[PDB]
Amino acid sequence: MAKSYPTVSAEYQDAVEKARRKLRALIAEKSCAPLMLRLAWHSAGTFDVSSKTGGPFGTMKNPAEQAHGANAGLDIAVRMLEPVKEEFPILSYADLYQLAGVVAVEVTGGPEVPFHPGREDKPQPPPEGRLPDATKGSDHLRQVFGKQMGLSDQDIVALSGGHTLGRAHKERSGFEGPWTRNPLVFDNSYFKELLSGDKEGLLQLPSDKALLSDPVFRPLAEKYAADEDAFFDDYKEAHLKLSELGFADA
Numbered sequence: 001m002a003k004s005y006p007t008v009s010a011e012y013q014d015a016v017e018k019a020r021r022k023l024r025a026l027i028a029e030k031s032c033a034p035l036m037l038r039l040a041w042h043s044a045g046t047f048d049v050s051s052k053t054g055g056p057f058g059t060m061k062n063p064a065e066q067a068h069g070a071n072a073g074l075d076i077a078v079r080m081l082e083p084v085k086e087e088f089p090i091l092s093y094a095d096l097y098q099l100a101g102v103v104a105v106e107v108t109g110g111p112e113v114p115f116h117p118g119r120e121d122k123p124q125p126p127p128e129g130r131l132p133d134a135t136k137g138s139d140h141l142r143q144v145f146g147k148q149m150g151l152s153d154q155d156i157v158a159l160s161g162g163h164t165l166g167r168a169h170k171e172r173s174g175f176e177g178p179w180t181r182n183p184l185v186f187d188n189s190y191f192k193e194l195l196s197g198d199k200e201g202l203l204q205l206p207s208d209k210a211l212l213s214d215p216v217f218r219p220l221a222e223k224y225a226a227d228e229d230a231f232f233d234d235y236k237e238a239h240l241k242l243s244e245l246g247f248a249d250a
């Protein structure tokens with residue numbers, strides 16, 4: 001669980017701060033914060049703690065990973081971000097993509113996810129099929145987030161709140177529509193729509209519904225719906241862990 005973060009060079013650090021700034025401008029301009037978060041999440045979410053494979057190590061650069069069914073459309077984000085790597089080539093893709101996720105959350109008014117640089121680009125994309133299945137239930141969530149990634153139940157519910165940004169695209173996952181009425185605003189609305197039941201014009205996956213059906217997940221969703229501050233804190237925490245799965249372990 002413990003971390004021993006590398007001190008990157010002053011050149012590297014400067015590249016990071018300059019990247020963050022370009023990312024803010026880009027993401028706000030193009031209104032692509034949700035897709036950037038999905039990029040960061042899918043880059044990180046392949047981690048498997050038993051084998052020490054996968055995780056946020058730049059492999060989404062490889063068109064092979066971009067070809068996984070779970071990752072349909074991330075090739076747009078990868079292309080979108082390439083001019084940032086071109087201006088700051090010292091940065092690793094792994095850092096670049098995780099930073100873009102952190103910036104995505106910030107630009108939409110979300111909490112400040114700390115960021116520690118130094119991730120190295122690994123050569124080997126992990127095996128496809130580790131990211132969650134939207135049709136499966138609470139026990140699948142714990143398989144992917146817990147047994148694989150190594151995150152907690154609280155993490156599962158908080159991270160699901162990321163669907164407060166963006167929407168499904170038929171051509172990408174086969175689902176359609178947003179979870180909230182403000183897909184460019186990072187807030188706790190996702191839990192409130194969930195707890196409100198299905199309604200016209202808003203998407204809920206079965207993976208979302210599994211939060212209202214489990215004794216641990218449901219109180220957490222209730223708590224996040226009532227108290228955006230506690231949602232922000234727990235999301236900040238989980239997103240930080242997610243972004244550093246397998247990285248700089250002590």
Ligand code: HEM
Nearest residue numbers: 034035038041132133134159162166167168169172173207
């Ligand atoms: C149970 C876990 C999850 C499932 C089953 C799931 C599934 C999906 C699916 C099917 C889409 C549709 C993509 C499309 O068609 O455009 C989507 C989009 C998205 N996912 Fe999730 N996801 C999960 C967890 C997460 C997490 C942990 C995050 C970030 C913290 C996240 C952030 C997003 C975002 C921001 C989008 C919107 C992308 C856009 O608007 O272009 N998801 N997700």
Ligand SMILES: O=C1O[C@H]([C@@H](O)CO)C(O)=C1O
Nearest residue numbers: 030031032033034035036166
């Ligand atoms: O989040 C997203 O941003 C882009 C587009 O909407 C704006 O560039 C993409 O297609 C989304 O899913």
Ligand code: NA
Nearest residue numbers: 164180182185
């Ligand atoms: Na929202």
